[PDB]
Enzyme design. Sequence first.
Site, PDB file in Angstrom:
ATOM      1  N   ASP A 100       0.800  -1.021  -5.805  1.00 18.37           N
ATOM      2  CA  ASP A 100      -0.008  -2.117  -5.517  1.00 18.37           C
ATOM      3  C   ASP A 100       0.750  -2.760  -4.013  1.00 18.37           C
ATOM      4  O   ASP A 100       0.780  -4.052  -4.114  1.00 18.37           O
ATOM      5  CB  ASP A 100       0.294  -3.101  -6.569  1.00 18.37           C
ATOM      6  CG  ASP A 100      -0.878  -3.672  -6.244  1.00 18.37           C
ATOM      7  OD1 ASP A 100      -1.893  -4.326  -5.600  1.00 18.37           O
ATOM      8  OD2 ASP A 100      -1.776  -4.072  -7.664  1.00 18.37           O
ATOM      9  N   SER A 119      -7.078  -8.362 -12.948  1.00 17.74           N
ATOM     10  CA  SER A 119      -7.756  -8.136 -11.151  1.00 17.74           C
ATOM     11  C   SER A 119      -7.475 -10.027 -10.703  1.00 17.74           C
ATOM     12  O   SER A 119      -6.348 -10.705 -10.680  1.00 17.74           O
ATOM     13  CB  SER A 119      -8.375  -7.586  -9.928  1.00 17.74           C
ATOM     14  OG  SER A 119      -8.541  -7.951  -9.318  1.00 17.74           O
ATOM     15  N   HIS A 150      -3.895  -0.620  -6.496  1.00 19.34           N
ATOM     16  CA  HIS A 150      -4.647  -1.897  -7.173  1.00 19.34           C
ATOM     17  C   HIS A 150      -5.931  -1.052  -7.789  1.00 19.34           C
ATOM     18  O   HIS A 150      -6.423  -1.861  -8.616  1.00 19.34           O
ATOM     19  CB  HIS A 150      -5.026  -3.408  -6.160  1.00 19.34           C
ATOM     20  CG  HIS A 150      -5.664  -4.032  -6.884  1.00 19.34           C
ATOM     21  ND1 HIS A 150      -4.831  -5.429  -7.564  1.00 19.34           N
ATOM     22  CD2 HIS A 150      -6.834  -5.037  -7.070  1.00 19.34           C
ATOM     23  CE1 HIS A 150      -4.686  -5.952  -7.451  1.00 19.34           C
ATOM     24  NE2 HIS A 150      -6.352  -5.869  -7.082  1.00 19.34           N
TER      25      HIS A 150
END
Lengths: 294, 293
Positions: free
Chosen positions: A200, A103, A230
């Site tokens: 995502d 991330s 995500h």
Amino acid sequence: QCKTIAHVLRVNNGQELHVWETPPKENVPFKNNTILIASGFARRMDHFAGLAEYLSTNGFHVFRYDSLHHVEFTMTTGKNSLCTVYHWLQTKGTQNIGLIAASLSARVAYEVISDLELSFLITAVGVVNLRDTLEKALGFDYLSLPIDELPNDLDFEGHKLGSEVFVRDCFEHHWDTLDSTLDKVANTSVPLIAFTANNDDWVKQEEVYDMLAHIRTGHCKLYSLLGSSHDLGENLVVLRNFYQSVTKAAIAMDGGSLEIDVDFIEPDFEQLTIATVNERRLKAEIENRTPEMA
Amino acid sequence: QCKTIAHVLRVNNGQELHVWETPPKENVPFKNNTILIASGFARRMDHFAGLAEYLSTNGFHVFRYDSLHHEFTMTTGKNSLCTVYHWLQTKGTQNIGLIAASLSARVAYEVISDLELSFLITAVGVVNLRDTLEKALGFDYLSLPIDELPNDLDFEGHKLGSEVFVRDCFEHHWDTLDSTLDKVANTSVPLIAFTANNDDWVKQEEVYDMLAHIRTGHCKLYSLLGSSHDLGENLVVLRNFYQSVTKAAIAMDGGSLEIDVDFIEPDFEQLTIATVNERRLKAEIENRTPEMA
């Protein structure tokens, strides 16, 4: 406790960073690369304690690290934490290092891959375009506001962010655009596997392909994590699909391959429970540890 | 001395700013609008002393102001204009036109949807700050990390302290053409934009692009004879500048945007005396009572 070691690294300005070391298991085959895991924004992932398990059960010596702090975060403090742990491994003698980052920490990793001597980089749902992801995450493009009209803090969970300090650093150290990423990535030689999540909404997959397409060595691969958004800790199936994917990639890339249909040893729920509870013991240990200067 | 009065405005934080006032000539027709001229960056233009001459010889009451100070940032430019505008308002002045050139015209486009101005006239005015600075300085310094910036940047005669200036551009969104296009879009103020025929620094296509985003459509672009970006390149380029803006201020004071209007032109002795009066004004500003603003 399973022999994971707590280290306090004390960087010369009054900043501290914690490092969690997990040795390889006793009788698995040799693994040439030491693994670094950026575990700073991973509160909801128990700081990747279970990924360190999956990797040491498969032969890797793992170091997980968090962020420099002074006893709020900017992307530049994340970059400095990674450069601090990295130079400390080099002086403890460690020469072959692979890095895993997910991330927001993956943007920090893409930033130094043309400058660091890494054997490989693996990222999961890694942000390539900070301004667009933060917009998607927070519902508004706060970077469009005058700095002085900024709300006091932003909640980008993994942690919470002081708006001014963080937005000032975005602009001043140019973290904000897809181009700042593509400029950095361009001249790298580090092999890279990029996992994107299927649904995502925060990281545009086309932007990831575009970044991979700028790596002028063409020595990279993109793979996708099934039915995930995500949030890699959404449920136990999405979580172990992350754990197993990243472990087969660490094994393949440790041997110079990018094809990840490889065999691995999987921890069972008991081993993973011991690693979760053993984190609470480590947190207390680090309460009184000698800092190591760096 | 000719009748120009100096004033020092001190704002509530201990920054001062200098204003130079020229009243209209006595027996010329009345002009409804007072004119403000952003003159801080105009050293090479003798701080616009002769444009004031041209304008007051035609009936305008003129105020010229510098920049707030106790280096410069674009926001310091905007606060200086907002200070003088607000100060003239307290004097009961109501109808106010503005003339701005080059860098100062970007400051003017920033506030034209917030201020009630009767008109705006700009000359060689920057619509895209990042592109002009690359062209002027030779390199895009805004692409560097703040900590790799040189100490100062020398822009158009004045030195700019680089860290404070570049921090402010991003922080207050002064840098792109789009920021200009947003501020300009819902304006009600009439605008005449003069561009120079071979200006490297400011692209004409982007000025037309800006004008085209003004929803009211009451704007006009006219071009200056030669000129590169430098309006004081020689006496002919300079007088075409002085003359073009005087016709545009005359025409717009009467709600027109077509500038084939008659005007009274100062001769060389009157412009020389304005230049020498500037030395006199500069000395006595230190023995001037500050005005709160």
